[PDB]
Structure 1
Amino acid sequence: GQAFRKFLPLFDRVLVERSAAETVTKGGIMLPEKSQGKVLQATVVAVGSGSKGKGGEIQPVSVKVGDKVLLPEYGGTKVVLDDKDYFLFRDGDILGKYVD
C-alpha cells in the first residue's frame, strides 16, 4: 500500500479527504454553514495493503491515490491527522470513481 503523512492503513481500508463543500451557487447566492450537508465527493489519499480474500493470494485495493471517488452517506470512520480531518472506509463501501 501507500502511506499518506506517515499513516499506512491496514488491509483494504482506504483513507480519503472529503472535498470542500459548496458555499456559493453559480448566480452568487451564498449558503449557510450548517446547511452545507455532508459532501459525498472525496479524493483517495491513502490505500491499504489489500485484504486476503483467499489463502496464498493477495487482492490489491481497487482504487489508487489520486482518484476522485463518491463516498456513501454512511460507513466512514473518523481520522485526525495534524488537526485535519480524514475518513477511513472499506474498499467495497466506495460507490464508484471518477475518470477523466
Structure 2
Amino acid sequence: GQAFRKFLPLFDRVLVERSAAETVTKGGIMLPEKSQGKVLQATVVAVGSGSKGKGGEIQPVSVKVGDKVLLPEYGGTKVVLDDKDYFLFRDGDILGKYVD
C-alpha cells in the first residue's frame, strides 16, 4: 500500500484530494464561492493494503496513486494533513477513473 505524507489508510480505504473548483466560466464570468457545490473529481494520493474478505492473501485496491477518479456524491470522510484537506473513501465507492 502506497502511503502519503506521514499517513497510510487501513484496509480498502483510499485517500484522495478533490480538484480545485471552477472560479470562472469560459467567457470570463466568475462564480461565487458559495456556489459550484463540491468537486467530484479527485486525485488518488494514498491507497490501503487491501481488503481481507477473500481467504489467504490480500487483494489490492483497483486504483493506484496518481489516478484521476470521479468521487460519489456522498460517503467521504474529512482528513486534515499539514493544514490541507483530503477525503477518505472506500475502494468500492469510487464511481470510475479517467483513463488517459
How many matched pairs? 100
Aligned partners of 2:66 and 2:82: how far apart in 1?
20
Aligned partners of 2:54 and 2:47: how far apart in 1?
20
| Cα deviation digits, residues 43-81 of structure 1 (max 9, x gap) | 000000000122212110100000000000100001000
Q: TM-score, normalised by structure 2?
A: 0.98
Structure 2 unaligned regions, length at least 5: none
Runs of 4+ more than 6 Å apart:
none
Structure 1 unaligned regions, length at least 5: none
RMSD of aligned residue pairs (Cα, Å): 0.6
Q: Which moved more, 1:39-48 or 1:52-61?
A: 52-61
Indicate the percent of aligned positions where both proteins have the same amino acid: 100
Q: TM-score, normalised by structure 1?
A: 0.98
Aligned partners of 2:68 and 2:86: how far apart in 1?
15
Aligned partners of 1:2 and 1:49: how far apart in 2?
8
Structure-to-structure mapping, 1:46-65, within 5 angstroms: 46-65=46-65
Aligned partners of 2:36 and 2:83: how far apart in 1?
21
**Other-structure match for 1:39:** 39
